[PDB]
Amino acid sequence: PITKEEKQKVIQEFARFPGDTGSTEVQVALLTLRINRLSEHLKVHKKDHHSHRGLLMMVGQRRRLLRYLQREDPERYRALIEKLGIRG
């Protein structure tokens, strides 16, 4: 599982500033985190379809905020993706 530490780090890591626990980029990060872990969990248990829905959802939720990130500020988008290695 994801551990507070493992988590908070990711936060602090992206947080647009001190105390920020919500900035899109944060959000996006954390997601991506879960996503990946999930994905991982799906590289096996390939028959755990249910979880994958969740995944699918996350993937979606993620790609939403992003599309919003651009619209509002293109830079913070490029900057973010690149830093998360999203796309592919």
Partner RNA sequence: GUGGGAGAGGGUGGUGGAAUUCCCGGAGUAGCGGUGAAAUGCGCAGAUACCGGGAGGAACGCCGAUGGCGAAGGCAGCCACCUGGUCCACCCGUGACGCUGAGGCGCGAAAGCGUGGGGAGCAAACCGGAUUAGAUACCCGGGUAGUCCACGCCCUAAACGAUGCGCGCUAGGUCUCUGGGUCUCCUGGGGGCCGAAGCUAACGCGUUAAGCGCGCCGCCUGGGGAGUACGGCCGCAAGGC
- Cβ-contact 35, 15 below 8 angstroms: no
Residues 6+ apart with CB under 8 A from 28: 14, 62, 65, 66, 69, 80, 84, 86
Residue 51: CB minimum distance to RNA, A: 3
Spatial neighbors of 16 by CB under 8 A, at least 6 apart, are: 23, 25, 26
Site map for RNA, 60-79, x if CB under 7 A? ----xx--x--xx-------
Gaps after which residues in the chain, C–N over 2.5 Å? none
87 binds RNA (CB under 7 A): no
Give the interface size with RNA as a residue count (CB under 7 A). 37
Question: Considering only residues 12, 13, 57, 74, which one is a binding residue for RNA as defined by CB under 7 A?
Answer: 57
Residues that bind RNA (CB under 7 A): 1, 4, 7-8, 11, 16, 19-24, 26-27, 30, 34, 37-38, 41, 44-45, 47-55, 57-58, 64-65, 68, 71-72
